[PDB]
């Protein structure tokens, strides 16, 4: 169920693995409240994941470069 | 009228007034327990049997 398809497991395994460590090292009567605490794992989980951050640099810099492009066409 | 005066004495030998207080109070009792009991057990919790941290304390052995 965490079998990796090439790999011996799947190649965000440990993540989510140090994600539920986090979750059950943790002492609150409530899971929603145990996940307030954990949510820098969650969030670098979902970072390896899909890369949704990654892909918003890259963006930022693609409009940045059309930007450099469209209002400035300087000549020698 | 001598039988009038024997069953009011009948009445007054059969009537204990202790008896009827005791019985007050055990009525009292039984019924101050129930509501007690019934306090208590009102401190009902439910989530999913899998919910580790609501079911932290008990002692379960899983197997998978």
């Given at each position: 169920?965490?079998?990796?398809?090439?790999?011996?497991?799947?190649?965000?395994?440990?993540?989510?693995?140090?994600y539920?460590?986090?979750?059950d090292?943790?002492?609150?009567?409530?899971?929603?409240?145990?996940?307030?605490?954990?949510?820098?794992?969650?969030?670098?989980?979902?970072?390896?994941?899909?890369?949704?951050?990654?892909?918003?640099?890259?963006?930022?810099?693609?409009?940045?470069?059309?930007?450099?492009?469209?209002?400035?066409?300087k000549?020698? | 009228?001598?039988?009038?005066?024997?069953?009011?004495?009948?009445?007054?030998?059969?009537?204990?007034?202790?008896?009827?207080?005791?019985?007050?109070?055990?009525?009292?009792?039984?019924?101050?327990?129930?509501?007690?009991?019934?306090?208590?057990?009102?401190?009902?919790?439910?989530?999913?049997?899998?919910?580790?941290?609501?079911?932290?304390?008990?002692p379960?052995?899983?197997?998978?």
């Open positions: 169920a965490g079998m990796g398809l090439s790999t011996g497991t799947a190649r965000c395994y440990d993540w989510y693995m140090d539920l460590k986090c979750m090292e943790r002492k609150e009567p409530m899971i929603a409240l145990r996940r307030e605490h954990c949510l820098e794992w969650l969030e670098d989980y979902n970072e390896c994941l899909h890369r949704e951050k990654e892909r918003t640099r890259r963006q930022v810099i693609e409009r940045e470069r059309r930007a450099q492009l469209a209002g400035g066409s000549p020698a | 009228a001598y039988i009038l005066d024997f069953l009011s004495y009948m009445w007054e030998k059969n009537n204990d007034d202790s008896a009827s207080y005791k019985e007050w109070q055990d009525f009292l009792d039984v019924a101050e327990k129930d509501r007690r009991r019934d306090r208590i057990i009102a401190w009902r919790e439910r989530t999913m049997y899998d919910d580790y941290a609501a079911n932290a304390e008990e379960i052995i899983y197997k998978r």
